[PDB]
């Protein structure tokens, strides 16, 4: 079917108000041509959804300071916003990696 790969990952989130921007987990989605997430994967309504084409996918250990930076991802634009992620591990970091790659070079 459509979905590609799914699961938790912590998203670098804007709060938008009194904290900024902090890791929060999240149940993303990766479909053909498509990302969204939840705060939880059952929650009842989606807090974002992007078309994928355009954006790049890159490991970046620069997102963060911790010993989790191995574990960092990042999908960037010149155009739009970029997202910044951490997975489990190194592991599933690259198959995230891997697995949107796929799909962004069929795209290109």
Not at 67 to 83: A, H, I, N, P, V
Not at 94 to 107: A, G, P
Request: charged share 30%.
């Amino acid at each position: 079917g459509s979905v590609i790969k799914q699961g938790y990952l912590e998203k670098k989130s804007k709060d938008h108000s009194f904290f900024g921007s902090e890791w929060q987990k999240r149940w993303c989605v990766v479909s053909r041509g498509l990302f969204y997430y939840y705060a939880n994967e059952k929650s009842k309504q989606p807090k974002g959804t992007f078309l994928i084409k355009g954006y790049s996918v890159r490991m970046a250990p620069h997102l963060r300071r911790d010993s989790k930076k191995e574990s960092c991802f990042e999908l960037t634009s010149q155009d739009r916003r970029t997202y910044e992620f951490t997975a489990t591990s190194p592991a599933e970091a690259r198959d995230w990696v891997d697995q949107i790659s796929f799909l962004l070079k069929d795209l290109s």
